Automatic annotation (TrEMBL), chain A:
Domain CHAT stretches: 511-638
Name of the protein in question: CHAT domain protein
InterPro entries: CHAT_dom
Automatic annotation (TrEMBL), chain B:
Binding site residues for Zn(2+) 1: C84, I116, C117
Occurrences of domain CRISPR type III-associated protein (ranges): 425-565, 638-826, 920-988, 1020-1166
NCBIfam families, per database record: Cas_III-E_gRAMP
Protein's recorded name: RAMP superfamily protein
Binding locations of Mg(2+) 1: G130, D133
Record-annotated disulphide pairs: C84-C123, C454-C466
Residues bound to Mg(2+) 2: G130, D133, A135
Keyword tags: Antiviral defense, Metal-binding, Zinc
Top-level taxon of the source organism: Bacteria
Binding site for Zn(2+) 3: C84, C117, C123, C126
Binding-site list for Zn(2+) 6: C454, C464, C466, C469
Length: 680, 1298
RNA sequence: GGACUUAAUGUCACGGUACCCAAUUUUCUGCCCCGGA
């Protein structure tokens, strides 16, 4: 009686304090825990003689608990589903009880409807659409239409109008309600009266307001789902809503989290695919003026480069961030707390320099790659500086992936003896992309820059074979350079010295003729080099070569390291420490297959240490795509020591880079070298 | 067209699942997970019977896999007949996809064929495939097949086709553990079947083309595994448990009727523990009984159940059942009691439960790929086997769940948790090491050896290509079962309250462990082209040889040091699979016969198997030198204990027949040689106490122990010791006694009792005894232990650990129980010479800094200079005429000051004091401290039966004084000084003269009753010395003999160092409260005199026909002896320390009384303070310092100021006042009782004795008239005058009130 | 012999460690004089 009432009042005070958006996520958990402890203590005694208010409070507390649990591994966790199920089961007996009041049933139906809406949102098999529709209709029949004072009934009405149940009688009250936001009003105008002017008017305001909200918010997910639903109905306004949302996201993303960070909500790939498709479709229309078509094709590459500019890591990797002095204390903590606060806020209240794409030196051609998962087609956008024109083309990639998987599986078992699958892979690359050997697409005798995409980063595009009787290789006509993204290019003037530095740390002296040459500098650590010696170069040398092993982390690219005579040096440590490598050419012997993990899917965005070197002022990195023997690396090092302005493609051409018909091992050993970076 | 019959036999426990149709299988998750298991279907409705019917599609899949492997090992040929590559792809159009789709790789070669296979001709590979036939995706005839496989049925050999599921299978839970945190998640469950009784299946294979028989017959013999086990293919009741549940409920109800519900768990554990003693403990009535009383006792075996005792009820239950056996009966009774108690009783509040996640059988559209792999031509393939033994170095534990929740075919909510935790066994009660745990440990070690790896994913559309998985897909292990089948032991654990340093109520939990020294078989197989070096590193890491430990951690509870194994007797062989394939197929790979291979001589090996000689050494492997060896470090040390040690065991005191109150702990050790449990136990200290001491020390040092909760905490204590989110980074082991054979008698018997405050005698039914280990200052005990530290520790945590070690070395944390009276004090610690050098450097440098001893400026005797005026009555009588009374009473109150703001134990307050006091002990009259354990210690009872005789207290032959007596003697004085309550008081007793109103407890004032709760507050005596609900803040130690003249040798008849005492009997209270209206007078104190001289000459005519056996004989020490003891304190305010120092030495002319024979003048002692040290736990860790008297005098002045403030009168001001203690009335009355009138040569020798009886007493002389018929009658001495006289000091009793 | 009980040109389940956190201990001096009918 009085004791139960007093305990219930204390629990409700705690819950109402926890519902305040001014609180922090740390204290909310403890407050909810104390409230649940009080309710369970009361229940363990008055199991059967309990009133409905206690059950309603317990269901509300479990609904609150379900919000504080965040995903960790790209999959919806099971604790969220368990909490929602327990809340529903707790409210079911209060519904089944024979009290006979009105407000009691009204509040119980409100809380059950919101719990079921959330449970259906995160899981569909356990809660079907028909069950939700029946429950919502039954709750509406009880009179849960107080749009002027509560938001949950507004949510119920919006969910009902999404399913197709008519709501003409309450439209005026819903629009008059002050608590409703622009997205809900746009949905009401669209799904009820089949009107588009007011829907556009309010959707523009919603998209403009999205510019200031972090991507952890549920408004982004709701807007992208609404755009997807509009597209699925063969409507018209999605082709502009997608572009506006893309613009808002591109503006918002520039928040400078370690200069490159991302939250990874589940979408943000479907939105970019839809924007790319809409721009391509509105570009394929026939207009007499060609300037609009050129602008649209340029915007396609702009969208591609905006997508490829950053990578995203999961929450469990963000919690285990290794500590540093300056960046770790400020930026990681600020970004993480801001993201968490934005995530938990929507469930309580309802309210250098980037270069231009056309700044390429005379005589160069740039090729952009995009892999559209939505329509299942590939793309390739080329820009010709000498003619100032834009072109694009399409291809299929569902069998090149299978051939690549076969090559990888055979290589990971028989390194040098799997050379008969590399030839097949190169021939498949040549057959799938016939526009690489066309004069209208790529003019012959010109330098080519490659900007690949998800699984094309690991294909030797420079060793293609033309689909004919005795077709030539791609490297016998052009010179090739690689770049993970166009945003990694920078202006650079080579005011460099003439010092050559060597660093080496091996278990055994595989290189003996090397380290005895008299051309090395005065700060070489030729045997037993450590991570502290890499940070001591201050004179901006001309050529730095590091010989060591590799170590890849399969989850966090920041923890990838080079094996030196110490604890090692990692991706983050190079960015934080090394400052004396501005304008210097770097030669690496780390066999990229050891620096990055193998792939088991179409997409990956694992950055190598070459990007870390490029971000601190290096002008170019040279390495091997797979594992070869030390004699080839030694020969490359001597050939580069003799002079430094020579081109790599001639070296690959004169040393058996075209003997795939006769001796496949020579081809395998010779085409493993490529240069990363763009000279300006 | 010939039909063959084949048989399939298992050698391991296989797996089973329920049968569903192809369409209905999609609804379940376990059914989709177990598509490669054996099947089970029901026979009836609501039934418990069925059959097992392993299908032919699984056998066909295994056979074609074997065919593919055999063809690949020979470049696509068999007996000179080439074969093509086959076909493993079907178009989605013009047909339908088959039922199971492939996901792994496929081995391919060069076809080398002239004709394309068709309907008219084919190679044996295409014949074995059902490629060109009349049979397709729909079964029609059963005759169109050129090769057919049927279902395989279990051989029910005996009878009763009604086969129950509970008779064949059992349930178990398996989990997945996160590599980084060390905590598991998303478990799952399965079924396991018995392979010893149900292990043979029979089927048929039909072949209608003789062109593939030669290959089919070899492929049948090349199959190694099926359904999760190794195999071979050859071509030919309610009444019991229900009645015990009813009896358990009756017992529980009977216990509940008397309000004793909390003893049910103890009863259950005690009953379960009886399985190690046999039926003779219940048939011959060997259970322990009461100490003194047989009725109304505190025991549990004598609690009435339905009008009869409990021991008899258990005897009748055993005589009634007598069929299941002793072990099963005890186990089931204990389980029923535990379950009933757990259900009835209904802390660690939990909101959500655990998650059961099954690897989803992933499906998609357009996601199937064909990935061929072609091995090089000319390469060779081998096969390696390893055989050995696994030896347990510590007690191990493999966890299972409650048997009432693992029944196959069977299974608003609140979360309730069990606290029993049994261990894994098989059906014959032998210890088991499952394959899954060993595989998990091997994967965990391989990932560490490689330096990288992947977190296991369960979707699996494309199989992983990382370094660990490639090698893991080539390794096969085997199940292991021992040859030992005796019951295990149970270990208890509790939790302490950081605020009061007492046991938290409701925190008991136990677990079962196996013995140390057991051995298990070991088998490993690897098939490939090259033997890896990481696996060699792991094998060398798991092996012990000549100065190396074994580092294989298996199972759970690694934080407390459970489950460390070692590998021994290793042999490695080799199969050649290119030239000797026929011998490999003929011998079946020696599957199931590895036991005979372990003991086989090298001259009996089968053809094709040779020893392996290129196995690398420990120091030649680059791994294990930079990845595995520096993983864990070791610290080993010895502890010296120079005092009795008692780590109590609570169940052995209930089950053993010794009839003892508190005994020590010991464990069982298995001996490999001679194959038996050793016939003697070993005393040790459990690793949980070892861990808790370090945890508490560090927590008090950093202040993390006073927090509220550690849910998402990242404090220093949570980083070092872990929490419910991450495992620990330090692992502890046991401390074992190593010099126990040097002692003539390892255990000692000691007795204790509580003394009343009013009557001065011992309290009824309050005596207790202990059995500690016999440690002494000149013969200590040696204990040896170790712990392990993980790499990567910071520079501050190492310093914290070394500081904890130093604090333990300095005697700040005693071991065991009863540490406040001198038990288990540490005298030193020695570190081994193999520990890391920096650890010893830190121990030496970070040692507590050396105090600067002052150059004897004020370092002499700390003498309290204060002379009491004494009493004027004996000073004016210099001819010794008066006769005094042996005891008087002290009356004060009734106003007791209580404090509700008590001081906690969880931190070192900066403004409080902590330190150590050293002092001596002179004696002024002969002292008697008996050794009660032996009632015939002088061997005089043979001639005089019934004459008790003792000797002086000693341990190992060294004279000592126990610390309990010192503590009690000081506590009584402190209570009297500060006006506290009566701690020990006889409550319920009545009076009768020659019926009264109330009892003795009813006439005592309510303010003088002992403190009973922390909510009302504590008086100074209970606040300083402690209570049941609050630990005291002072500790006293034993006192050892230093010097002195000799015994009290006197020239008599029987041993010269003894003395026959007089009669000593029965203090009676009805002499100070004569007629039914008087309150108790108060505390009783005795006087100082030399009445012992009269008895030394009255001996001999004391012995002769005066007392037959009423008196006793004992050894007596002379005067002039010196002893020494120590006192410890912590967190004391300044006035408390001042009062402690004042009551420990009240000045000159004042002494204490101690021992037996106080009314006769025995036992006058005087204590002087020798030194005083103090430390303070601050940021810089200030060292030990020696205080001057310039601070001691201030402390005493502050104590005096506190006393005069408690006096309540503002007329007496407070400030800097010279302390004259005789100003306070009650202190003035107290110091007269403790006055020594013969300290200096001012003899003033008084005369004190009790009055004799009426007129005919033995020692009465005519004259004085000092009998009880004169000063005992209300005619010459009124009652009020009598009370006034006996409640007053001197001014004697002889004439009267002179 | 058949059924309960398979489907056939495609089964990595030896693809997953019942794992993680808690001091059997706090308080007590082996002491002792006046009456039984
Ligand atoms: Zn064939
Ligand atoms: Zn892997
Ligand atoms: Zn903590
Ligand atoms: Zn008290």
């Amino acid at each position: 009686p009085t004791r139960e009432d007093i305990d219930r009042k204390e629990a409700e005070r705690l819950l109402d304090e926890a519902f305040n958006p001014r609180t922090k996520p740390v204290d909310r958990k403890k407050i909810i825990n104390s409230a649940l402890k009080i309710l369970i203590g009361l229940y363990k005694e008055k199991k059967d003689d309990l009133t409905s208010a206690s059950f309603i409070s317990i269901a509300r507390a479990y609904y609150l608990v379900s919000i504080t649990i965040l995903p960790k591994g790209t999959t919806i966790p099971e604790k969220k589903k368990e909490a929602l199920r327990k809340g529903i089961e707790f409210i079911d007996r209060a519904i089944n009880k024979f009290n006979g009041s009105i407000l009691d049933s009204q509040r119980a139906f409100r809380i059950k409807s919101v719990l079921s809406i959330e449970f259906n949102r995160i899981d569909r098999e356990k809660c079907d659409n028909i069950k939700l529709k029946n429950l919502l209709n039954e709750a509406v029949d009880k009179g849960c239409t107080d749009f002027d004072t509560y938001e949950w009934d507004i949510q119920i009405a919006i969910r009902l109008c999404e399913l197709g149940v008519d709501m003409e009688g309450h439209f005026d009250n819903l629009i008059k309600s002050n608590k409703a936001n622009d997205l809900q009003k746009a949905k009401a105008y669209y799904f009820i009266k089949k009107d588009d002017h007011k829907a556009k008017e309010h959707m523009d305001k919603c998209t403009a307001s999205l510019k200031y909200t972090p991507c952890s918010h549920r408004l982004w997910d709701e807007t992208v789902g609404f755009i997807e639903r509009l597209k699925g109905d063969s409507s018209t306004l999605w082709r502009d809503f997608a572009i506006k949302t893309y613009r808002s996201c591109r503006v918002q993303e520039k928040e400078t989290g370690t200069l490159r960070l991302r939250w990874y909500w589940s979408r943000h790939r479907v939105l970019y695919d839809m924007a790319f498709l809409a721009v391509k479709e509105q570009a394929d229309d026939e207009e007499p003026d060609v300037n609009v078509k050129q602008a649209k094709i340029k915007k396609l590459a702009e969208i591609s480069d905006s997508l490829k500019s950053r990578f995203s890591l999961r929450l469990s990797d963000m919690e285990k961030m290794p500590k540093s002095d300056d960046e770790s204390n400020h930026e990681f903590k600020k970004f993480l707390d801001k993201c968490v606060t934005a995530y938990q806020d929507g469930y309580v209240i309802n309210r250098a320099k980037l270069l231009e794409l056309t700044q390429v030196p005379e005589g160069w051609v740039v090729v952009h790659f995009y892999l559209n998962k939505l329509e299942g087609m590939g793309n390739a956008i080329v820009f010709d500086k000498c003619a100032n024109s834009w072109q694009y083309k399409e291809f299929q990639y569902k069998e090149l992936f299978e051939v690549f998987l076969t090559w990888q599986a055979n290589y990971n078992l028989y390194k040098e003896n799997a050379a008969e699958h590399l030839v097949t892979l190169c021939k498949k690359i040549g057959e799938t992309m016939p526009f690489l050997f066309c004069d209208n697409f790529i003019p012959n005798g010109k330098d080519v820059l490659f900007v690949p995409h998800d699984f094309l980063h690991r294909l030797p595009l420079h060793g293609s074979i033309e689909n004919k009787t005795n077709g030539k290789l791609f490297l016998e006509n052009h010179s090739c350079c690689y770049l993970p993204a166009w945003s990694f290019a920078s202006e650079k003037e080579a005011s460099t010295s003439d010092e050559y530095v060597l660093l080496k740390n091996f278990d055994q002296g595989h290189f003996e003729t090397l380290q005895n040459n008299q051309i090395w500098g005065t700060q070489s650590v030729k045997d037993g080099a450590s991570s502290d010696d890499l940070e001591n170069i201050r004179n901006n040398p001309r050529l730095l070569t590091i010989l060591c092993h590799g170590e890849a982390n399969m989850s966090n690219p920041f923890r990838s390291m080079l094996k030196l005579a110490n604890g090692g040096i990692t991706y983050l440590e190079i960015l934080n420490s090394v400052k004396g490598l501005k304008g210097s050419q770097v030669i690496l012997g780390a066999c990229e297959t050891d620096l990055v993990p193998p792939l088991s899917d179409v997409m990956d965005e694992h950055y190598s240490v070459a990007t870390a070197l490029l971000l601190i002022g290096a002008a170019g990195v040279v390495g091997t795509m797979w594992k070869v023997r030390s004699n080839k690396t030694k020969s490359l090092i001597e050939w580069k020591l003799e002079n430094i302005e020579y081109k790599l493609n001639e070296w690959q051409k004169e040393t058996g880079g075209a003997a795939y018909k006769d001796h496949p091992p020579t081809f395998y050993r010779s085409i493993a070298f490529r240069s990363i970076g763009f000279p300006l | 067209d010939m039909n063959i019959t084949v048989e399939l036999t298992f050698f391991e426990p296989y797996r089973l699942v329920e049968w569903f149709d192809w369409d209905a299988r999609k609804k379940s998750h376990s059914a989709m997970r177990g598509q490669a298991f054996a099947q089970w279907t029901w026979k009836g409705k609501g039934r418990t019977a069925g059959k097992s019917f392993i299908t032919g599609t699984l056998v066909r899949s295994a056979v074609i896999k074997a065919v593919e492997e055999l063809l690949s090992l020979n470049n696509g040929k068999w007996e000179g007949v080439p074969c093509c590559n086959g076909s493993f792809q079907t178009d989605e159009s013009k047909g339908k996809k088959p039922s199971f789709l492939r996901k792994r790789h496929t081995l391919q070669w060069q076809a080398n064929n002239k004709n394309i296979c068709d309907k008219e001709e084919a190679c044996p590979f295409c014949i074995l495939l059902g490629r060109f036939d009349n049979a397709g995706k729909v079964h029609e005839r059963n005759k169109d097949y050129d090769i057919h496989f049927s279902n395989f049925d279990l051989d029910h050999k005996q009878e009763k086709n009604d086969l129950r599921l509970v008779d064949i299978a059992s349930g178990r839970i398996l989990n997945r553990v996160d590599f980084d945190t060390g905590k598991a998640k998303d478990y799952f469950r399965t079924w396991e079947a018995d392979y010893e009784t149900y292990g043979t299946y029979t089927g048929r294979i039909t072949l209608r083309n003789e062109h593939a028989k030669k290959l089919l017959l070899a492929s049948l013999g090349f199959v190694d595994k099926l359904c999760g086990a190794l195999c071979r293919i050859e071509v030919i009741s309610e009444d019991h448990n229900d009645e015990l549940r009813k009896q358990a409920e009756v017992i529980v109800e009977a216990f509940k009727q008397n309000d004793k519900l909390e003893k049910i768990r103890i009863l259950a554990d005690a009953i379960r523990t009886l399985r190690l003693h046999g039926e003779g403990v219940i048939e011959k009535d060997e259970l322990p009984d009461g100490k003194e009383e047989r009725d109304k006792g505190h025991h549990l075996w004598d609690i009435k159940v339905q009008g009869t005792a409990l021991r008899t009820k258990l005897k009748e239950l055993w005589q009634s059942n007598k069929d299941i056996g002793w072990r099963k009966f005890t186990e089931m009774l204990g389980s029923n009691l535990y379950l009933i108690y757990k259900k009835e009783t209904g802390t660690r509040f939990r909101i959500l439960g655990d998650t059961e996640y099954y690897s989803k059988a992933h499906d998609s559209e357009g996601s199937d790929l064909f990935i061929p792999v072609t091995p090089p031509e000319g390469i060779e393939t081998k096969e390696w086997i390893i055989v050995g033994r696994l030896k347990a170095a510590t007690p191990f534990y493999f966890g299972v769940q409650q048997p009432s929740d693992s029944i196959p075919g069977k299974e608003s909510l609140v979360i309730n948790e069990h606290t029993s935790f049994n261990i894994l066994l098989d059906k014959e009660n032998r210890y088991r090491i499952p394959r899954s745990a060993l595989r998990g440990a091997l994967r965990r070690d391989l990932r560490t050896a490689f330096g990288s790896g992947c977190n296991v994913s369960l979707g699996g559309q494309i199989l992983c290509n990382c370094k660990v998985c490639i090698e893991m897909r080539r390794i096969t292990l085997k199940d292991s079962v021992s040859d030992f089948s005796e019951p295990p032991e149970i270990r208890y654990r509790i939790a302490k309250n950081p605020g009061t340093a007492t046991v938290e109520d409701g925190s008991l939990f136990d677990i079962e462990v196996g013995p140390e020294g057991l051995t298990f078989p070991f088998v490993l197989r690897y098939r490939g082209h090259k033997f890896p070096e990481q696996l060699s590193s792991v094998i060398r890491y798991w092996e012990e040889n000549d100065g190396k430990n074994g580092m294989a951690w298996l199972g759970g509870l690694d934080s407390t040091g459970k489950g460390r194994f070692a590998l021994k007797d290793i042999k490695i062989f080799e199969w050649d699979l290119n030239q000797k394939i026929n011998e490999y197929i003929k011998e079946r790979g020696m599957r199931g016969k590895e036991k005979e291979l372990l003991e086989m001589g090298e001259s009996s090996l089968p053809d094709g198997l040779i020893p392996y000689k290129f196995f690398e050494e420990r120091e030649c492997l680059f791994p294990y030198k930079e990845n595995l060896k520096p993983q864990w470090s070791e610290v080993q040390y010895t502890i010296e204990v120079g005092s009795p040690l008692l780590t109590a065991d609570t169940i052995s005191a209930l089950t053993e027949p010794g009839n003892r109150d508190a005994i020590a702990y010991k464990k069982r050790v298995y001996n490999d040689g001679n194959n038996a449990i050793e016939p003697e136990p070993r005393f040790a200290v459990k690793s949980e106490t070892h861990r808790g001491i370090f945890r508490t020390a560090v927590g008090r040092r950093t202040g993390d122990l006073g927090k509220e909760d550690h849910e998402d905490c990242t404090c220093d204590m949570c980083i070092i010791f872990g929490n419910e989110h991450e495992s620990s980074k330090i692992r502890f082991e046991d401390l074992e006694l190593i010099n126990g054979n040097e002692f003539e008698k390892l255990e000692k018997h000691i007795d204790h009792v509580a003394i009343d405050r009013f009557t001065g005698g011992a309290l009824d039914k309050a005596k207790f005894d202990t059995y500690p280990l016999a440690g002494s200052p000149k013969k200590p005990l040696k204990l040896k232990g170790r712990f392990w530290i993980k790499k990567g520790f910071s520079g501050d945590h190492k310093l914290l650990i070394t500081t904890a070690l130093s604090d333990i070395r300095d005697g700040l944390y005693p071991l065991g129980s009863k540490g406040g009276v001198g038990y288990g004090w540490v005298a030193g610690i020695s570190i081994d010479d193999n520990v890391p050098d920096d650890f010893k450097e830190m121990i030496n440098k970070t040692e507590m800094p050396l105090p600067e001893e002052v150059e004897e400026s004020n370092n002499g005797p700390i003498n309290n200079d204060y002379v009491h005026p004494g009493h004027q009555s004996p000073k004016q009588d210099h001819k010794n005429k008066n006769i005094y009374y042996p005891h008087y009473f002290l009356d004060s109150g009734s106003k007791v000051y209580r404090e509700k703001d008590i001081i906690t134990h969880e931190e070192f307050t900066e403004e409080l004091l902590s330190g150590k006091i050293n002092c001596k002990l002179e004696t002024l009259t002969p002292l008697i401290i008996p050794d009660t354990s032996d009632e015939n210690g002088l061997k005089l009872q043979g001639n005089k039966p019934g004459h008790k005789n003792y000797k002086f207290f000693n341990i190992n032959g060294e004279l000592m004084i126990p610390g309990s007596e010192l503590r009690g003697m000081l506590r009584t004085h402190f209570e009297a000084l500060t006006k506290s309550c009566f701690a020990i008081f006889g409550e319920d007793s009545t009076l009768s003269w020659r019926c009264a109103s109330k009892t003795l407890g009813g006439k005592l004032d309510k303010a003088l009753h002992p403190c009973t709760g922390l909510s009302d507050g504590l008086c100074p005596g209970c606040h300083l010395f402690g209570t049941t609900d609050y630990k005291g803040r002072v500790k006293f130690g034993f006192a050892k003999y230093e010097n002195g003249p000799e015994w009290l040798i006197t020239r008599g008849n029987n041993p010269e160092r003894s003395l026959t005492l007089g009669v000593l009997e029965s203090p009676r209270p009805a002499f100070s409260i004569p007629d039914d209206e008087s309150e108790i007078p108060g505390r009783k104190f005795y006087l100082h005199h030399n009445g012992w001289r009269i008895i030394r000459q009255k001996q001999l005519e004391i012995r002769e026909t005066v007392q037959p056996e009423r008196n006793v004989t004992t050894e007596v020490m002379d005067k002039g002896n010196v002893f020494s003891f120590d006192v410890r304190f912590e967190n004391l305010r300044e006035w408390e320390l001042g009062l402690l120092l004042q009551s420990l030495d009240p000045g000159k002319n004042i002494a204490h009384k101690l021992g037996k024979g106080k009314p006769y003048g025995f036992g006058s002692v005087k204590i002087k303070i020798d030194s005083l040290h103090t430390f303070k736990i601050n940021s810089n860790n200030d060292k030990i310092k020696r205080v001057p008297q310039s601070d001691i005098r201030e402390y005493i002045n502050k104590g005096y100021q506190k006393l005069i403030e408690w006096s309540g009168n503002n007329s007496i001001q407070k400030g800097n006042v010279l302390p004259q203690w005789h100003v306070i009335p009650h202190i003035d009355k107290l110091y007269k009782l403790l006055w020594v009138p013969f300290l200096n040569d001012s003899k003033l020798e008084p005369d004190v004795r009790y009055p004799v009886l009426n007129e005919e007493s033995k020692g009465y002389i005519e004259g004085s008239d000092y009998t009880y018929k004169k000063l005992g009658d209300k005619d010459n001495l009124p009652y009020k005058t009598r009370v006034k006289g006996l409640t007053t000091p001197w001014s004697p009793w002889n004439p009267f009130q002179v």
